[PDB]
Amino acid sequence: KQYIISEELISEGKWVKLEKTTYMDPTGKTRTWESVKRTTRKEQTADGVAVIPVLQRTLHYECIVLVKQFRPPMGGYCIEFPAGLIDDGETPEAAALRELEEETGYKGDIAECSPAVCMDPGLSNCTIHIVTVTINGDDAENARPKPKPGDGEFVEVISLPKNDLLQRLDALVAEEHLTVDARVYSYALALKHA
Amino acid sequence: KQYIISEELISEGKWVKLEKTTYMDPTGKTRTWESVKRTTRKQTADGVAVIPVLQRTLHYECIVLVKQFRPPMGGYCIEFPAGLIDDGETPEAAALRELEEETGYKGDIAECSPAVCMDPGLSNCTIHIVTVTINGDDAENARPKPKPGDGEFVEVISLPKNDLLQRLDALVAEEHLTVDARVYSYALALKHAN
Ligand SMILES: CCNC(=O)N1CCN(C(C)=O)CC1
Ligand SMILES: CCNC(=O)N1CCN(C(C)=O)CC1
Ligand SMILES: [Cl-]
Ligand SMILES: [Mg+2]
Numbered sequence: 294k295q296y297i298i299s300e301e302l303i304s305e306g307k308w309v310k311l312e313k314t315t316y317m318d319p320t321g322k323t324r325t326w327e328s329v330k331r332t333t334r335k336e337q338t339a340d341g342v343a344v345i346p347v348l349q350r351t352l353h354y355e356c357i358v359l360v361k362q363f364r365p366p367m368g369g370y371c372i373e374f375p376a377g378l379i380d381d382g383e384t385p386e387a388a389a390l391r392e393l394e395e396e397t398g399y400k401g402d403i404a405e406c407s408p409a410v411c412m413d414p415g416l417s418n419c420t421i422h423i424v425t426v427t428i429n430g431d432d433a434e435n436a437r438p439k440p441k442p443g444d445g446e447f448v449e450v451i452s453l454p455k456n457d458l459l460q461r462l463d464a465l466v467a468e469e470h471l472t473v474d475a476r477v478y479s480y481a482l483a484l485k486h487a
Numbered sequence: 488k489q490y491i492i493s494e495e496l497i498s499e500g501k502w503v504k505l506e507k508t509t510y511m512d513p514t515g516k517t518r519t520w521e522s523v524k525r526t527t528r529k530q531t532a533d534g535v536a537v538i539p540v541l542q543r544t545l546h547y548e549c550i551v552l553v554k555q556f557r558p559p560m561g562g563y564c565i566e567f568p569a570g571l572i573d574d575g576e577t578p579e580a581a582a583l584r585e586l587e588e589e590t591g592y593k594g595d596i597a598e599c600s601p602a603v604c605m606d607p608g609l610s611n612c613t614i615h616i617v618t619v620t621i622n623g624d625d626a627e628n629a630r631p632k633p634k635p636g637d638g639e640f641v642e643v644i645s646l647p648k649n650d651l652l653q654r655l656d657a658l659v660a661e662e663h664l665t666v667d668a669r670v671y672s673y674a675l676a677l678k679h680a681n
């Protein structure tokens with residue numbers, strides 16, 4: 294029933310733009326919406342990837358590998374899945390494994406790859422693939438993992454046991470001002486609810 | 488180590504603005520970041536998203552989702568019920584209210600997250616994730632009455648919790664739809680648990 298009629302540029306930065314979207318509502322009436330888009334999406338199936346990295350080690354409980362970084366939009370530190378935009382020509386899988394190694398030092402193995410999923414669909418068209426990766430933490434490659442941050446990236450790695458993830462996130466939030474990401478919280482909630 | 492120095496308004500709509508954020512990198516180098524904010528926040532967070540667990544005896548437990556045309560996405564999305572928190576509304580009350588408006592179900596609060604970030608590389612947007620159970624055998628939830636506000640148009644899709652990820656994949660394959668990343672993350676962790 295509903296569809297886009299037009300998209301008028303309001304303001305375009307280097308990285309993000311704002312658009313006035315005109316669409317057809319299901320009663321047959323024309324309405325508008327203010328929409329955010331990135332300027333960086335070419336032929337990628339999504340803007341970015343986020344990596345669910347499952348660290349597996351003999352005689353250890355499985356951990357979820359997370360990263361903490363300062364996020365200027367939020368004006369503070371956030372705890373997130375490792376993530377980055379997909380480079381032109383790059384596969385989501387390749388991007389996931391590259392970002393995971395850049396941000397954490399770990400060399401993972403692909404487990405699964407989601408379809409393109411929407412970040413905040415009332416606000417923006419931004420999409421990611423959520424890529425599940427296992428890390429063989431008994432491999433010597435993953436013994437002394439050193440992040441390779443790119444220019445203007447400072448990332449801290451936080452590995453938390455899967456079997457206690459939500460409580461461990463709560464204890465981090467109780468101890469300093471930081472924000473957990475909604476996807477991480479959602480995943481930690483489901484682990485509890487299961 | 489890192490912090491905001493200044494914020495420069497680039498463009499302000501009715502519902503969203505774009506800013507250029509100046510911040511101090513941890514080396515002591517000054518850097519810029521294009522950021523989106525909502526103009527509507529006054530609140531613990533911008534919004535709530537509700538995880539609605541529909542419990543009916545002798546049936547599988549379901550998670551109740553909503554499908555809506557999302558103009559920034561140009562298409563239909565499958566999401567947790569959700570909306571912005573009204574000025575002077577608590578997240579809990581926002582959750583029950585949005586759930587009722589979007590689904591017609593009347594639910595009970597189970598737990599409530601802290602404010603969690605939606606896309607912290609892009610925006611300052613935050614929600615509370617609110618877990619709500621729905622007693623689907625109570626008379627008030629027998630024939631659930633959805634109350635769409637002006638120009639909301641919401642389809643309710645209930646999916647079994649114990650097969651959620653495969654059911655969502657199925658919808659994406661048959662119906663050219665975009666699943667929400669928080670939905671998808673929850674579904675993944677239901678599979679990944681234990
Ligand atoms: C017809 C439904 N109306 C809404 O819920 N709003 C949401 C805010 N929005 C934006 C971002 O431009 C305009 C309309
Ligand atoms: C060199 C470290 N900084 C970055 O990676 N960014 C992110 C993209 N961007 C935005 C949204 O404004 C500015 C540069
Ligand atoms: Cl529950
Ligand atoms: Mg990143």
Ligand SMILES: [Mg+2]
Nearest residue numbers: 376377392395
């Ligand atoms: Mg990176």
Ligand SMILES: [Mg+2]
Nearest residue numbers: 568569570589
């Ligand atoms: Mg809504």
Ligand SMILES: [Mg+2]
Nearest residue numbers: 570585588589
């Ligand atoms: Mg509503």
